[PDB]
Amino acid sequence: PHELESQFILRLPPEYASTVRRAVQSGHVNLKDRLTIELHPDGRHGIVRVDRVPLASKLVDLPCVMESLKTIDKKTFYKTADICQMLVSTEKKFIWNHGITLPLKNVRKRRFRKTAKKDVEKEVKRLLSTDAEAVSTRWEIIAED
Amino acid sequence: GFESPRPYKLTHQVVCINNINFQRKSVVGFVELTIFPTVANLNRIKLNSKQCRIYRVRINDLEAAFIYNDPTLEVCHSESKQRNLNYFSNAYAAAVSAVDPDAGNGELCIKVPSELWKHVDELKVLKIHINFSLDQPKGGLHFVVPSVEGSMAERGAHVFSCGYQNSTRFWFPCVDSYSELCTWKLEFTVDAAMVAVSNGDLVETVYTHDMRKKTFHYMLTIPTAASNISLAIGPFEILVDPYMHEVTHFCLPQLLPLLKHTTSYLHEVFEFYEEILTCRYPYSCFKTVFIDEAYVEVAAYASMSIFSTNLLHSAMIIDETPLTRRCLAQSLAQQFFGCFISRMSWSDEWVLKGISGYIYGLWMKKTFGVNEYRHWIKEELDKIVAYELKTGGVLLHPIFNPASHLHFSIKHPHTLSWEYYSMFQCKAHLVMRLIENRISMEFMLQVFNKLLSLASTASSQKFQSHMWSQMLVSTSGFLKSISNVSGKDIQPLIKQWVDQSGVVKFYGSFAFNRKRNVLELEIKQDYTSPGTQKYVGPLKVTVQELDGSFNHTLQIEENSLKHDIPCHSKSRRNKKKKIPLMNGEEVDMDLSAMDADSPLLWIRIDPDMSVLRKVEFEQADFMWQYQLRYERDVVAQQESILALEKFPTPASRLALTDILEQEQCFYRVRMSACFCLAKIANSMVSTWTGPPAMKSLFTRMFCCKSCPNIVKTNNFMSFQSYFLQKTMPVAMALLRDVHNLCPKEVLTFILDLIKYNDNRKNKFSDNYYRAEMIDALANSVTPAVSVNNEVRTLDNLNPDVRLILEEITRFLNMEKLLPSYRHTITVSCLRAIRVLQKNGHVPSDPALFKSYAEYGHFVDIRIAALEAVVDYTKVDRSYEELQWLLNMIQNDPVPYVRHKILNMLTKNPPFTKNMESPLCNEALVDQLWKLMNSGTSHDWRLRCGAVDLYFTLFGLSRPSCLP
Amino acid sequence: PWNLSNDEYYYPKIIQHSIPAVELRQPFFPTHMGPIKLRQFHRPPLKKYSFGALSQPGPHSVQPLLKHIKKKAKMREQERQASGGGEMFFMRTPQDLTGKDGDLILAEYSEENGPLMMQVGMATKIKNYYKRKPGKDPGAPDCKYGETVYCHTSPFLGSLHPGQLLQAFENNLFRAPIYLHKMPETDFLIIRTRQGYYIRELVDIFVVGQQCPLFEVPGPNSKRANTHIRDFLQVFIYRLFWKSKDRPRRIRMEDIKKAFPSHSESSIRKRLKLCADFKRTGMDSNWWVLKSDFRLPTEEEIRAMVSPEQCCAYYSMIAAEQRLKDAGDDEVRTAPWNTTRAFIAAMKGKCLLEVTGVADPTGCGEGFSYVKIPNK
C-alpha cells in the first residue's frame, strides 16, 4: 500500500539555523551525523541535536494550513502533503498563534473568525461512561452558590 | 531498432548519365556504389535493375561476373493451362517477393571476385562500378518528344522519371528500397539549351569542350533512399520564387505566365507547414517541375516535386485554383513526411500516409475553413465505408496471408490494386484524425516535431547508419513517441482501427417516454456483413432539446440495445424564448411542427465522426427539417438533406427552399439542396402547385429585376453564387413531367440561359459555367419513343432534341475555333452526345469518339472519348471496339491513358461473371491472361489494373466460359 | 478562391493530474474516512511507526538530499531531451510524487476550511493575470513561476487595476489569488518516512487568498452525491477485478467490506449483482467470479466513470457534514454546498451575493461571503 508522507516544519535558533542551512546546501552525508531528531513519548516534546549540541523542542499546531506543491515545469503544481505542525527549537502551549509568513501574525487572535476550534465531546464520552455506573441521579438547574 | 535485411550497408552512390539521345530514346551511364559489408563471406551482392542493359561491372576496379534474371517479366509460364486468378496472384506475389530489396533479394546478382575475399572478411569497403544503357525504355523514364521539327529544345522534348513507390530500378541499378539511405552524387550531361533538374543542390554546371553540351552536378548530403531520387531534363523556363529564394519553378516553354500565377501561393503553404510543425524545411532547395504526359497528377521526391502542366491556370480561371492549390499542398506534406522521414518496412506505411494526409487536412482547415474541412472529412469517410462494404476491407499495418478476402496480396505495394492504394491513404489519414481525437492536437504536433527532430539530428551525422536509421519511422516507434509525449497509449484504438480491417454500421431508433421524461435510444449494429466489425467502445450522441444542445456518452457493449438518457424541460414552449444552439447563439424556431409532449428537436448519433461508421438513424421528418434549418454543423445539414429525400412532404420542400435562399449557409449544402429539391419535386408531381422548382428562385437570385427571362450579365466575383448559379440548372433539368418527359418550361429556360449569356464584363472565364450548361442540356434528355426499331434519321428527330443538338453542335464547333481552358466544353459536348446516343436519338456510332480518342488530342478529351467508347462497347456488345480498347491498352504512348482505360473498363465492364455474353470466348480469356502475364510487365500499375479487369470479368475461380 | 464558409453564423465565437490521481489509487484518494479522520481532514497528524528504522526509539540522523535532487533533475532532463526536447509528462508512478526531488514551493491557505481542496497527486497551474496600463505599457512584471496571461475581464470578483499583476492558482476545482512571500530564515522542511528523516530548505511560500469555487460541492444525499457514492464503489470493484490474477477474474467480498465499511452489504451486493456471481461450492467457492459475458471496462472507461475533482467535492461535503454534526442556520449557510452553489450561480448571473455576511471565512471585514441575495 501507499502511506501519505508526513511533512512538518523545523524552526531552529538563528545561528544553529545558519549552520544547518550551510550543511544542507553543501550536500554531504556529514550533515546526517550532525543533525539528529529525538521525539519524546509525550508527542509534543523533543530534542534536536545540531552538531551534537542538544536543543529543546516543542511540536506545535499551526493556525493556518500549508500545502507543499511540487512542480517540474514551474507552471503546473501538484499538491504533495498538508503541513500543520512545527517543531520549534530553542494543550494551549502546543498551539502556535502566529503564521509562518510575515503578513500572518496573531492570525488566530485577529484574522480568524471565532466560530470555535474544539475536548468538550471527549469529556462527554467520559461522563456517559461514568453515568452508566448509576441507578439514581439528581440534577438541578442552579443559581449563585 | 532497425536491422538491415541486406548483408551490406550502402554509404554513397554516384549516378552519372551521359548521351541522353532524344531521337533514339536512349541513355548511357554508369553507377558507382560504395558498400560496407556487415557479414564476412559476402560473396554475391544483389542489386535491383529493370530494363537496363548491364555492360560491365567492376568491383574495386576488378572485373566481376554478374547474372541477371527478372521473374516478374513473365509471371507464369506460357505453356501452363491455368486460368484462375488466385494462381496468378500467388505467383505474382512470389515473383515480386523474389526481386524484393526488402528481403535480401534483387534482380542483378554480382559475384565478388576471389582476390577480394580477404578484403571482405575483415569488413572493408567495396566500390562497385556498373555501367549501363537504356536502349528504348518502356515506362522507366518517360520521353515526351513532339513531332514538330527543329532542335529538341525548339520542339519541346523532355524526359522525366515516372512510376510509384520503388520504381527507380527502372532507370538505374540501385538498392531500390526505402530503408537503404545513402548520400548521393548526380551528374547529368545534357544539351546546352536544356536544363537537368534532380534531387539535392546543384553545386556547379560546367560546359563540355565543344560547348554543345553541359554537365549538371547535383549533390545530396541528406541521406535519402534510391526510391526518392528523380530526374527531369528539358528546355524548361526557370522562375525563381520572388518570396522564398531557394525555391525554383520549372515549366515547359510558353507557359511562364501560368507558372507565375499558379506557383504564387506556395510560400504560404511553406509557412503553414513550418509553423504547425516546428522544424524548418529539411532540404536546402525545393524544385517544382511541370511536365506533359505525367504519370500521376502530383509526384513528390526528395527536394523535388513533379506536377503535370494541366494544373497550370491563369488569373481568370476559377474552379481550378483550389484543386491546384491542394495538389501543391499535399506535395509539400509528402516532402515533409514521405521523403525526409521514410518507412522502415512495407508495414508502417500507414504511419507516413496518415501523417501526410492529416497535416494536409490541417492545411485545408486553415486555408479553406473548418466547414470545408468537415465536408472533406465526411466525403472521405463515405468513400471508405462504401469501399469497405463493397469488398472486404482495408488493412493498415498487416503482419506477415493476413487479408484473404480480396484478390491480390498486400505484402508489397506493387501488387496492390490502385483503388486499394487510394483507399489505403484515405483510411490512414482518417485513423490519424482518430488518434488526434483521443490524444489532443497539440500533443499530436509534438509527436510529429519529435519525429522530425530525431530525423534532423540524424540527417547531419556522417556515420554510415550508426544514426541514419533514426530517419526511418516504424509503428512501434510512433506509438512509443506518442506514449512519451502524452502518457496515454492508444493500443485499443490501434487494435480496433488499424490491425482489424473493418468499419461499423449503426442502426438507431428512439422513443420518448413522456412519463419518466427520458429518451430511450435503440442502437443495434450489423456485424455480420462482410465488411463490418463490432464496436464496443463509448459513443457520443448529441440531443437538441428546447433547453439547448446536450452531449451524452453511451457505453455500447455487445449485449446492449436500449440506452435511456434523461431529457430536460419544455419551458421554452410555455414562453416564446429563443432556443440555444450547439454554439453559443440562439434562434427563433417555428415550433408548430414539433410534438406537444416531447422537448427534443433532433438527435445525432456520433456527431464528431469519432469512429469509422455508417449511421442509419430513424428520426421524424420534422426533426430532419429542424436539423436542416437550424443546425450549426455542415455534416448534419448534409445528412438531413440526404434523409429528406424519403419524406416528400411540402414542409420538406419549404425547408430546402429556405436553405437555398439562405446566404450564410455553406455553399456545398445549398448545392446539395438543389438536387434534393429536384428529387422531391419529381416525387410530388400531380401535387405541385406553381412553377417548376428553383425557376422562380433562379429568376429572383440571378436574373434582372425588369426582365425575368433574361439572365444578368456574368459577374463571377462572389464565388458562392457562381457555384450555386452553375449548379442550379443542372439540378433543374432533372425535373420530370407526369408523362416522364422533362417540361418544356425548364428546357426553354436552360436554352435562354445559354442564348443570353454575356461574359465580356467579368474578370473570370466562362468555361465551367458553359460546360455545366451543356451538362444541364444533357440531363433533360429522356428516352425516345422508337416505333418498330425505326432507324434514327434526321427527319424523325424529337422537336426537343433538335434544339439541344443544334446547341451542342454550335458549342463544339465554336470550341474548335475558340478553345476553352481545358477543353471543358469539348468534354461536356462529348458527354452530351453520348447521352443522346444512349437514348434513341442519335445513331449509335462510335466513330466520332474514336476520332477524339487519338493521340494528338488533349488528355481530357481523350479520356472523355474513351469513356464514351467503353460505354458503347458495354451497351452494343461490340467485339471490335473491345479489341480496339485492348489494343490501345497495349500500345499507347501515354501510360496514364492506358491506366485510365483499364480503370474505366473495370468500372463499367463489358460483361460481368454472371452475364452470358457473346464476348466470353476462350480468345478473350487468353488475351487477358496474356495481358496479365506478359504485356503489362513494365508498369506495375497496368498489371494490377489487368488483374482487376480479369477479376471483374471472370472472377476468382476458373473462367467458366472455357473448355 | 476564398473562405466561403459562413462561419460567423454557424460558430459565433487542460489540467493533467498524476497517473496515481486519475486512477483514484487508495493512499491518495481514501475510500472511507471515519469521524476522527474527518476531523483531521487535510491536517494529518504525525503517526508513530510500528515497524521500521524510525519505530525504534532514540536519536535519528537527518539526511541531506541535494545529490538526489540534482541527480533526479539531470535524469529528467536527459529523458526530456531523449524524447525530442518538448514538454514531457513525468508523474507516472507514486514514487514520482515524493518531496525528495523537484522544485518544491509551499502554499499556505488563508481560510481554515476551504470549500474545495486538492488531494495528494493532483495538479494545478499558476496563472499571472496582468492588466495592461491604458495606452503604452512596459510589459508584465516578470515572475519566477507560472505563465502570464493578459486579462481584460477580471477572473475574480473584483477587477484588476491598470498595470497590476496578480498570480493565481488555477485548476478545475477553484481559482484563488496567491501571493509570493519569502520563507522565514529559521524554517526547514523535514520529510520523514519509515527509513529516516530528510531535510530540504524552502525559499518560496505562497499565501492563498479566498478561493473562487469552480466545482459545486453536492449536498448530503443529493443527486451528485447519490451518483458519486455508487460510482466510486463501482470503480473500486472494477479495479479489484482487474487486479485479480485468477483467469476467471474473482474477488472477495470482505476486501470491499474493508474498503467501504460504512456501506450496507445490500448496496455492495447490488453493485456485484450485475458483472459478478457468487460461487458457493466446488472451485472458486466463496468468491465472486466475473461473468463470462461481461466485458470488464478498459482503463479509459474506468477513468471516465469518476473524476478526481468529484472525489474532492465529496470529501469536502463529508468533512463539512462532520464539522456541522459535531457543532450541534448561519453555520448551514457556511456549508460548502450552499456557498459553491451561490458562487457558481453568481458567476452565471442568476443572482447576487451579499459580500458582507456570516459566510465570511475571516470573521472580519476582509474576505467575501458566498450566499445568495437578489439581483433586484
mmCIF file of C-alpha atoms in Angstrom, chain B residues 558-559, chain C residues 290-295:
data_model
loop_
_atom_site.group_PDB
_atom_site.id
_atom_site.type_symbol
_atom_site.label_atom_id
_atom_site.label_comp_id
_atom_site.label_asym_id
_atom_site.label_seq_id
_atom_site.Cartn_x
_atom_site.Cartn_y
_atom_site.Cartn_z
ATOM 1 C CA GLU B 558 -22.088 -6.430 -27.114
ATOM 2 C CA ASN B 559 -25.349 -7.259 -25.278
ATOM 3 C CA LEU C 290 -16.712 -12.306 -13.090
ATOM 4 C CA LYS C 291 -19.475 -13.212 -15.525
ATOM 5 C CA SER C 292 -18.186 -14.698 -18.763
ATOM 6 C CA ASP C 293 -20.353 -12.490 -20.978
ATOM 7 C CA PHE C 294 -19.381 -9.331 -19.091
ATOM 8 C CA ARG C 295 -16.664 -7.262 -20.750
#
